[PDB]
Swiss-Prot record:
This is DNA beta-glucosyltransferase. It catalyses: Transfers a beta-D-glucosyl residue from UDP-alpha-D-glucose to a hydroxymethylcytosine residue in DNA. GO terms for biological process: DNA modification; symbiont-mediated evasion of host restriction-modification system; symbiont-mediated suppression of host innate immune response. The keyword Glycosyltransferase applies. The lineage of its organism: Viruses, Duplodnaviria, Heunggongvirae, Uroviricota, Caudoviricetes.
Length: 351
């Protein structure tokens, strides 16, 4: 029994980038789960084997970490191409980890045939034929099966809270009380505008001391539909494995998602925030039934309510700690199902 995990459109090396990080974390959870795994990437490294130094069939299971198959600019991307070649020559079922609404599996050949460097590849070389099993972290598999309507070989859809791997790591631990220097914080990319409305709403013009770390930059927010005057301070990216210490820097941390994330996906930032020293403030529309935490104080419907909830936490340290204590206790309740989670994952990949 041997398992291989690879990223479909990103090189894997260290914790500098997010796609590389989530892949190594997945590598780690599966190993700690008592399974023999290898990460296959462009070159050999601390956590990876080289695409051209291994035989895809030495493995009995192939797990693919979703990614964008877009060749930005006029250049070939080996991360995407090499990953698809690897997959293309694999005989058995491929397990596609669908963790981002906008990254469904898809043939890369259509995007290559018309490129000018198309002569370097053949259809037979990149055309992935194996049956595809899509493991979606969305409770309602129907967002996943909708994005995968155009692709044939996809014969299966199964739910599984993939991103719970942050809390099931053996080295995981809750953030400790930390000297506050921020009112609210949020870390992530611009998501190519898919979430501008929510970001402007809860992080702009609040009158509070807010920070937006991550890849997003101020100058990207210019959609006329979502005006603003005072923007939050942008501080750039940091390693994924430093995210909880960062959130812990603020009194409260924001949880928002894409439209199709709502009442479906319980993302990674939910656990990174819930486990930090920052009170978790969820956007109502993101989890209307309150599945994350059954206490309406952790939810904010709009900008005014956020400002209000925060002014409360700023006025009462007794309240801030009471809420921290509550979310931490709830997080521990999900952790106590580690065994049940690992088993569900083993079943997902037909083990
Ligand atoms: O500087 C940063 C900001 C974010 N992240 C990671 O990227 C995720 C955010 O991803 P994205 O911006 O796509 O938001 P989502 O769509 O996951 O809500 C966070 O949860 C972290 O794991 C990171 O590693 N460094
Ligand atoms: Mg994500």
């Amino acid at each position: 029994m041997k398992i291989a995990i690879i990223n479909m459109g990103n090189n894997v090396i260290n914790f500098k980038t997010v796609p590389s990080s989530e892949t190594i974390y997945l590598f780690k959870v599966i190993s700690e789960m008592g399974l023999n795994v290898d990460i296959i990437s462009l070159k050999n490294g601390v956590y990876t084997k080289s695409f051209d130094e291994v035989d895809v069939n030495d493995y009995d299971r192939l797990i693919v970490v979703n990614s964008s198959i877009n060749f930005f600019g006029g250049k070939p991307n080996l991360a995407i191409l090499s990953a698809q070649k690897f997959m293309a020559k694999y005989k058995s079922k491929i397990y596609y980890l669908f963790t981002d609404i906008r990254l469904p599996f898809s043939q890369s050949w259509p995007n290559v045939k018309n490129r000018p460097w198309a002569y370097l590849y053949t259809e037979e070389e990149l055309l992935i034929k194996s049956p595809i099993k899509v493991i979606s972290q969305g409770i309602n598999l129907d967002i996943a099966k909708a994005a995968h309507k155009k692709v044939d070989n996809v014969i299966e859809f199964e739910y599984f809270p993939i991103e719970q791997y942050k809390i099931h790591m053996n080295d995981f631990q809750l953030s400790k009380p930390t000297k506050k220097t921020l009112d609210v914080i949020y870390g992530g990319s611009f998501r190519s505008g898919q979430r501008e409305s929510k970001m402007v709403e809860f992080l702009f013009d609040t009158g509070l001391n807010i920070e937006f770390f991550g890849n997003a930059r101020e100058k990207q927010f210019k959609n006329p539909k979502y005006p603003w005057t005072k923007a939050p301070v942008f501080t750039g990216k940091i390693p994924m494995n430093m995210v909880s210490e960062k959130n812990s820097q603020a009194i409260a941390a924001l949880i928002i998602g894409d439209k199709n994330y709502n009442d479906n996906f319980i993302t990674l930032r939910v656990w990174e925030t819930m486990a930090s020293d920052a009170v978790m403030l969820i956007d109502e529309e993101f989890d209307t039934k309150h599945r994350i935490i059954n206490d309406a104080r952790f939810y904010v419907n709009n900008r005014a309510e956020l400002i209000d909830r925060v002014n409360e936490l700023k006025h009462s340290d007794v309240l801030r700690k009471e809420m921290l204590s509550i979310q931490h206790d709830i997080l521990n309740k999900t952790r106590a199902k580690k065994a049940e989670w690992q088993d569900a994952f083993k079943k997902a990949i037909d083990l």
